[PDB]
Each structure stands twice: as structure tokens, then as C-alpha cells.
Ligand binder design. Structure first.
Ligand SMILES: Cn1c(=O)oc2cc(N)ccc21
Ligand SMILES: [Mn+2]
Ligand SMILES: [Mn+2]
Lengths: 137, 137
């Protein structure tokens, strides 16, 4: 049986700007780097950056909704979002639901999110106000 | 500051086959399903499937190396990989080895992986057989 997420690998077009973004701007820990990649950690998340000549810098309009959300406390949310805004990081969506979320792009157009709250909190909200066609198990 | 992965959202072209893949074949826990999405969990991982008409099924040769790996134990690895092959699940190829892994595709061409081992184990293996240009911090 599967026990969780082992690692997330993002293809990047240029290693140096991506390391700067994830390590310096976002504060992740850099464990190792090589000619074509890097290993970072963010809490219990193992993140791999893989240099890939196939990766296009992709505008948000030309990619689908696939995205990766990082955990942050409500107390830290506003100052972290302000840091991204000062660095000029682009936003790809406004938060229109309950729950604190900030939607931002990485240098290659990967869709990222800061989110406060757990699955259990989302499910409780949804039991009060279910989406169209919602069934629980 | 960031503390890990909050959730992973995959855009899917058809909801029913994707739910079946992650729940029936991969054994993830289905918590809720509605007309345009589903919430699943895999250990600590919160997985969201989001129906997206923009999602195209892409051959692995024309998508980049971005991929998602799930943890499995040494005792279950081979028999789980055997069940996927028997079910006709397609495969893809990465440019580099990263230990005991099996690489497979979901119905929309998202690149998935089963992997045995932690970041710490990977770093120890790399010290004996480093990638080209590798440096450790
Ligand atoms: C088969 N099925 C299920 O188990 O939960 C559903 C929810 C919706 N909206 C539509 C179909 C199903
Ligand atoms: Mn999200
Ligand atoms: Mn991998």
C-alpha cells in the first residue's frame, strides 16, 4: 500500500533562478545540487528540481489547473504573501473561496499556492455547504 | 514560513476514470466526490482531482520531467508494480536513475512513480555514486 508522497519533482529551464526562488525567496533547505538538478526540503516535503531542456516557461493561460499548495500558518500568511509581492512574483488566480489562499507562479510557470488549513477543515466546511453533486464517503 | 505540502491538485479530463484509478487501482482513500472534483488522501497527502476541460492527454515524450512519487515499502514494491503492469498501466522514462522506482502514467498522462526510500537514504547513496558535479550542503 502507498503511505504518502515521497517526492515532488519539478522540471526547470534554468537551475540557478529556480534554486534562488525555492531556497532564498521561499526559504526551503538546499541539501545537494549537481549539474542538472537539486534536492531541497520543506518540512517533510522532498522537492527535486530537474533541469529539463523540454521545459517551457509557460504562461498561466496555456497550462491547466494542476498546482502545488504549501502549508503556512495563518499568523505568517500575510507577511509571506507581502514578501512575494515585493519580489514581483506573479499571481495567477484570486482566492474566491473560504480559507486563506495565495496563488503564485514560479519562474517556469509552475502553479503554486500558499494555503492555511487541512483536509479535515475543508471537509467540515463542505458538509455545511456542499458543492453541487457532492457525496461523502 | 513554509512547513510542507498542503495539497496536490491534479487537473483531469474525465472525473470518473481518474477517481477509479486513484481509488480502485492505487488504493487511496476517497473522502468526497462532486460534479467537478474529488478529495482523496494517501497517508498524510491530500490529493485533489479537479475536472478541467483544458487538460489534454499528453504522450510522455512531449511532456517534461515534472512528476509525483509515492512512498511504498520494500516488501510491497515488486508486487504492487506487478499489479500495475497487469492492469495495463502505461510507463514513462526518466533521464537518470534515482534508486528503486517504478514509473507509470495516470489516465491523463500525469507522470507518477513508486519509490522506496527517503531523502536521507538518497543522499547517502549519492555520496557513493554521485551525480555529475554533485555538491552536498
Ligand atoms: C458513483 N458516484 C459516487 O460514488 O459518488 C458520486 C458522486 C457524483 N456526483 C456522481 C457519481 C458518483
Ligand atoms: Mn489548491
Ligand atoms: Mn522521482
Amino acid at each position: 500500500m502507498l503511505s504518502g508522497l515521497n517526492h515532488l519533482t519539478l522540471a526547470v529551464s534554468q537551475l540557478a533562478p529556480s534554486v534562488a526562488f525555492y531556497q532564498q525567496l521561499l526559504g526551503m533547505t538546499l541539501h545537494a545540487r549537481w549539474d542538472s538538478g537539486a534536492y531541497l526540503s520543506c518540512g517533510d516535503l522532498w522537492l527535486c528540481l530537474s533541469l529539463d531542456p523540454q521545459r517551457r516557461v509557460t504562461p498561466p493561460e496555456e497550462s491547466d489547473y494542476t498546482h502545488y499548495a504549501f502549508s503556512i500558518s495563518e499568523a505568517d500568511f500575510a507577511s509571506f504573501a507581502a514578501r512575494l509581492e515585493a519580489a514581483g512574483v506573479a499571481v495567477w488566480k484570486l482566492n474566491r473561496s473560504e480559507g486563506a489562499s495565495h496563488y503564485f507562479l514560479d519562474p517556469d510557470g509552475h502553479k503554486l499556492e500558499l494555503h492555511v488549513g487541512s483536509l479535515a477543515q475543508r471537509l467540515a466546511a463542505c458538509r455545511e455547504q456542499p458543492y453541487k453533486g457532492m457525496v461523502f464517503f
